[PDB]
Amino acid sequence: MILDTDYITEDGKPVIRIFKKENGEFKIDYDRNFEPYIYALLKDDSAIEDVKKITAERHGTTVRVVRAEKVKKKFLGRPIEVWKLYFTHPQDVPAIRDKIKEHPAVVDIYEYDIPFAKRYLIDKGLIPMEGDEELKMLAFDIETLYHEGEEFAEGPILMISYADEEGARVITWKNIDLPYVDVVSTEKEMIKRFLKVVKEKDPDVLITYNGDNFDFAYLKKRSEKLGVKFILGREGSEPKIQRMGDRFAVEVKGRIHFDLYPVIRRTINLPTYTLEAVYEAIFGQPKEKVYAEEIAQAWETGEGLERVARYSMEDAKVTYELGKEFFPMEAQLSRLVGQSLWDVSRSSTGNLVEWFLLRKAYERNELAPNKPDERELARRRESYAGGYVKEPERGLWENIVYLDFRSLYPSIIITHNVSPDTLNREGCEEYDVAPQVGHKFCKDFPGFIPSLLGDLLEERQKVKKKMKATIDPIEKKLLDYRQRAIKILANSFYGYYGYAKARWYCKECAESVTAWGRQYIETTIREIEEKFGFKVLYADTDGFFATIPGADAETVKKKAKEFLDYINAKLPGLLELEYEGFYKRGFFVTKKKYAVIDEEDKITTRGLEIVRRDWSEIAKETQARVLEAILKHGDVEEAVRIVKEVTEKLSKYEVPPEKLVIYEQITRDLKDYKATGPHVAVAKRLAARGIKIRPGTVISYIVLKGSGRIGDRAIPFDEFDPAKHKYDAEYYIENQVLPAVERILRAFGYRKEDLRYQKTRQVGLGAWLKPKT
């Protein structure tokens, strides 16, 4: 299968490179005959003779149009005739571009900024990674000594750990005796060793968590100092530190640097993307806890090195796991969009759609619109949105069903043939009118995107069909991923329409789709209420929760499914409402905030869980415990009593201190946080330890009863000595526990003052509450 493509330049001529792995064998194919080009729409063909002579300079070398060829294409649903202008090197384009475009007979140019190595995949009709070649992967992580106040990588790498199917290990130059640890003499031999292992294992994939903006840059700066040639690429080249947004991204020629960060930060979303938090959100299991202080302690004390070496092998093992978890999925997106996994991996969904349309545009001979110039980019102001939102019936309800539309937006885009090339077409004989903004979309001819989406959804339904009939759980999961990639892509079109950098950008389309969305959801809610006696408890954009007051659970389910048949028979085209599931109870705080429980006693919440970077078990637990009382036991009063007891136990120091440990990923040097807060004290505590914690790291501390502002005295959990150190109950009550439960109970008529008894050392200072939460 094709892994990736690039090109090198020999004597000013581009040579495309195709990295492959066929029959478990690596190989690099070359192509010296691919010519870069652009299209030019002229007012009159006679101007081509002028165009064919346009010239530009490039490092003293004269750049010229190598050849012209008039071709017929489709653009904006109307046939168009433009000239395909060829050149020698992709980099000549930018230099000759502006001049050609400046010619009076040139209406304008197109497809003049599509990267050569991608243009190649699209044009040559190649698809990265088809088949199921077993790819060998490898993850790694490093541990470093922070030297606050100095240039990047001023301190040394103490450990380099990695993991794969053959287990995990740790290479280090510190004094350690563990079966999985390799002790070398120096940071230098450590790194070289690490480089010998990789080249040894010859993995096709290198897995890391945020390796794009740290690990590779660190390994590079250290190897630069220690005079080590940081070679990892099958090519023999060092990693390439290409920059993207305000970030960077590393690429290893011949292999695939799969950085889990961009990917995971794309799939799910939750507060703090610490590898710790992330890991658990994906496996519903705890990862071995972090001890940034103990690690830094091991560096200076030398005591605890065994435990620390164990933490690194853990980090690598976990990382390889997250990688063996997300790579399959990403592989499918890559195959679907038609670009490298390296690219698809670090791409916004808006750009994912873009490369898909470009590939389709080629296959269907559709000219691609250009990207918006700088001023146009200004003109494309968002601020517009608006899905149907119904203020919830607060309180506790039972026998609830969740019903939602099947791919609401795509379905709308398809059935109403919504796209730029169908918008307000002159002399249109058949058209649908957008509910709001009243744009007219022609139906005399299927639109470019609508047609594409339509095929996509049909391909999804088809793969699902084979998935369910496939008995082998192996190919089943494969088809499963294929089916999910399509979902992810199709769900990205609505967005793409209003995406500023979009070639096929179209505000009218986005607005109309949103407008149709509201109408359908509104139409469906009227029916279920007037014709079926349902009570819609909550609704948002493409789905709603409903019940039948006083009705049996079987009745509600049976009635809801009878409603589906009824309604789907009235909805136009692809618009369809589905039974998402059943819930015994659920309650709605307010729009976007709710909790429900299925017949498996599983609680799904929304807009209720944790918020910031500083959480604790005591908070996690108490909230969970509150949701259980209300939804499992169905007793709002047991929940309030639970908060009050936890409050009591905290004021009587009867709460175990390890449930009070606060974990926080620092975003700056502790030494430099606001004067108020525990950070400064912790910093000074660690500094006495001679420790310096690198921002981004996860700190573990406890707030104690001090002699100043509450929450201002805190120490790392390490130094917590029960006999000499007592925690600030007021801080855990007001800053942690209560804010993690105050909104939920407020929804049930309970004011803050009701969650803590009258005489409970109350300090009447709800100032400790999490700021602007």
GROMACS .gro file of N, CA and C in nm, residues 538-592:
model
  165
  538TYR      N    1  -3.688   1.794   2.559
  538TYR     CA    2  -3.567   1.864   2.521
  538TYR      C    3  -3.546   1.846   2.371
  539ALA      N    4  -3.494   1.948   2.303
  539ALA     CA    5  -3.471   1.938   2.159
  539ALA      C    6  -3.356   2.026   2.119
  540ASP      N    7  -3.273   1.977   2.027
  540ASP     CA    8  -3.160   2.057   1.983
  540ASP      C    9  -3.104   2.021   1.846
  541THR      N   10  -3.132   2.107   1.749
  541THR     CA   11  -3.083   2.092   1.614
  541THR      C   12  -3.134   1.973   1.534
  542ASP      N   13  -3.091   1.852   1.569
  542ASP     CA   14  -3.132   1.736   1.491
  542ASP      C   15  -3.188   1.619   1.570
  543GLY      N   16  -3.232   1.646   1.692
  543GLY     CA   17  -3.287   1.538   1.772
  543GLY      C   18  -3.356   1.590   1.895
  544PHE      N   19  -3.436   1.505   1.958
  544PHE     CA   20  -3.506   1.543   2.079
  544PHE      C   21  -3.540   1.422   2.167
  545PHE      N   22  -3.562   1.449   2.296
  545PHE     CA   23  -3.600   1.348   2.394
  545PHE      C   24  -3.749   1.370   2.418
  546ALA      N   25  -3.826   1.262   2.424
  546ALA     CA   26  -3.968   1.275   2.446
  546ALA      C   27  -4.024   1.158   2.527
  547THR      N   28  -4.141   1.180   2.585
  547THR     CA   29  -4.206   1.078   2.664
  547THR      C   30  -4.358   1.098   2.653
  548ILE      N   31  -4.432   1.008   2.715
  548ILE     CA   32  -4.578   1.017   2.717
  548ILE      C   33  -4.617   1.013   2.864
  549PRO      N   34  -4.653   1.130   2.920
  549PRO     CA   35  -4.691   1.139   3.061
  549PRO      C   36  -4.778   1.025   3.113
  550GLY      N   37  -4.724   0.955   3.212
  550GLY     CA   38  -4.797   0.846   3.274
  550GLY      C   39  -4.804   0.720   3.193
  551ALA      N   40  -4.732   0.716   3.081
  551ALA     CA   41  -4.737   0.597   2.999
  551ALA      C   42  -4.628   0.496   3.031
  552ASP      N   43  -4.667   0.370   3.015
  552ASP     CA   44  -4.584   0.253   3.036
  552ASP      C   45  -4.461   0.263   2.946
  553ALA      N   46  -4.348   0.210   2.990
  553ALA     CA   47  -4.226   0.214   2.908
  553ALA      C   48  -4.245   0.147   2.773
  554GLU      N   49  -4.314   0.034   2.771
  554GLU     CA   50  -4.337  -0.039   2.647
  554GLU      C   51  -4.428   0.042   2.557
  555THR      N   52  -4.519   0.117   2.618
  555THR     CA   53  -4.611   0.199   2.541
  555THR      C   54  -4.530   0.308   2.469
  556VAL      N   55  -4.448   0.379   2.545
  556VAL     CA   56  -4.367   0.485   2.488
  556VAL      C   57  -4.282   0.437   2.372
  557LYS      N   58  -4.214   0.325   2.390
  557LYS     CA   59  -4.130   0.270   2.285
  557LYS      C   60  -4.215   0.234   2.165
  558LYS      N   61  -4.320   0.156   2.189
  558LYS     CA   62  -4.407   0.112   2.081
  558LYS      C   63  -4.469   0.231   2.009
  559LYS      N   64  -4.508   0.333   2.084
  559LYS     CA   65  -4.569   0.452   2.025
  559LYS      C   66  -4.470   0.537   1.947
  560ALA      N   67  -4.347   0.545   1.997
  560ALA     CA   68  -4.245   0.624   1.931
  560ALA      C   69  -4.210   0.561   1.795
  561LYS      N   70  -4.205   0.429   1.790
  561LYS     CA   71  -4.172   0.361   1.665
  561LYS      C   72  -4.288   0.371   1.566
  562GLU      N   73  -4.410   0.384   1.618
  562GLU     CA   74  -4.526   0.399   1.531
  562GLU      C   75  -4.524   0.541   1.478
  563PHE      N   76  -4.459   0.630   1.552
  563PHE     CA   77  -4.449   0.769   1.509
  563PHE      C   78  -4.349   0.779   1.397
  564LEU      N   79  -4.241   0.703   1.407
  564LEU     CA   80  -4.140   0.706   1.303
  564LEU      C   81  -4.203   0.668   1.171
  565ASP      N   82  -4.264   0.551   1.163
  565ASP     CA   83  -4.327   0.509   1.037
  565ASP      C   84  -4.416   0.622   0.986
  566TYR      N   85  -4.501   0.675   1.074
  566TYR     CA   86  -4.590   0.783   1.036
  566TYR      C   87  -4.516   0.902   0.976
  567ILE      N   88  -4.423   0.960   1.052
  567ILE     CA   89  -4.349   1.078   1.008
  567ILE      C   90  -4.257   1.062   0.888
  568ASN      N   91  -4.179   0.954   0.885
  568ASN     CA   92  -4.088   0.935   0.773
  568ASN      C   93  -4.162   0.922   0.641
  569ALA      N   94  -4.290   0.888   0.650
  569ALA     CA   95  -4.372   0.876   0.532
  569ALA      C   96  -4.411   1.014   0.481
  570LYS      N   97  -4.403   1.114   0.568
  570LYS     CA   98  -4.438   1.251   0.529
  570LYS      C   99  -4.316   1.336   0.496
  571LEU      N  100  -4.200   1.301   0.549
  571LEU     CA  101  -4.077   1.377   0.522
  571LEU      C  102  -4.031   1.354   0.378
  572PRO      N  103  -3.980   1.460   0.313
  572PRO     CA  104  -3.931   1.462   0.175
  572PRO      C  105  -3.798   1.393   0.160
  573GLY      N  106  -3.779   1.331   0.045
  573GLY     CA  107  -3.655   1.262   0.014
  573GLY      C  108  -3.582   1.185   0.123
  574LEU      N  109  -3.454   1.218   0.141
  574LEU     CA  110  -3.370   1.153   0.239
  574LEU      C  111  -3.394   1.189   0.385
  575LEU      N  112  -3.477   1.289   0.412
  575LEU     CA  113  -3.503   1.323   0.551
  575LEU      C  114  -3.571   1.210   0.626
  576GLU      N  115  -3.505   1.162   0.730
  576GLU     CA  116  -3.558   1.051   0.807
  576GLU      C  117  -3.528   1.063   0.957
  577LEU      N  118  -3.627   1.031   1.039
  577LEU     CA  119  -3.612   1.036   1.184
  577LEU      C  120  -3.592   0.894   1.237
  578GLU      N  121  -3.497   0.875   1.328
  578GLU     CA  122  -3.470   0.742   1.382
  578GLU      C  123  -3.485   0.734   1.533
  579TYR      N  124  -3.495   0.610   1.581
  579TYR     CA  125  -3.507   0.577   1.723
  579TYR      C  126  -3.362   0.566   1.768
  580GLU      N  127  -3.315   0.660   1.849
  580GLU     CA  128  -3.177   0.653   1.894
  580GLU      C  129  -3.164   0.563   2.016
  581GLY      N  130  -3.264   0.565   2.103
  581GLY     CA  131  -3.259   0.481   2.221
  581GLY      C  132  -3.366   0.512   2.325
  582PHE      N  133  -3.366   0.435   2.434
  582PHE     CA  134  -3.461   0.454   2.543
  582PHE      C  135  -3.389   0.482   2.674
  583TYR      N  136  -3.453   0.561   2.760
  583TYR     CA  137  -3.396   0.596   2.889
  583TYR      C  138  -3.505   0.591   2.995
  584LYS      N  139  -3.472   0.531   3.110
  584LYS     CA  140  -3.568   0.517   3.219
  584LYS      C  141  -3.597   0.651   3.285
  585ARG      N  142  -3.493   0.730   3.308
  585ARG     CA  143  -3.511   0.863   3.363
  585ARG      C  144  -3.405   0.953   3.305
  586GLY      N  145  -3.430   1.082   3.317
  586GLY     CA  146  -3.337   1.181   3.270
  586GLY      C  147  -3.393   1.310   3.324
  587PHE      N  148  -3.311   1.412   3.334
  587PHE     CA  149  -3.360   1.539   3.382
  587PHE      C  150  -3.284   1.641   3.301
  588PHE      N  151  -3.342   1.758   3.282
  588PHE     CA  152  -3.274   1.859   3.203
  588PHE      C  153  -3.260   1.988   3.281
  589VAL      N  154  -3.134   2.025   3.303
  589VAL     CA  155  -3.102   2.145   3.377
  589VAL      C  156  -3.145   2.263   3.293
  590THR      N  157  -3.095   2.265   3.170
  590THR     CA  158  -3.127   2.368   3.074
  590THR      C  159  -3.073   2.319   2.942
  591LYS      N  160  -3.105   2.393   2.837
  591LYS     CA  161  -3.061   2.361   2.703
  591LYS      C  162  -2.915   2.319   2.712
  592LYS      N  163  -2.878   2.214   2.640
  592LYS     CA  164  -2.739   2.168   2.637
  592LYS      C  165  -2.684   2.104   2.765
   0.00000   0.00000   0.00000
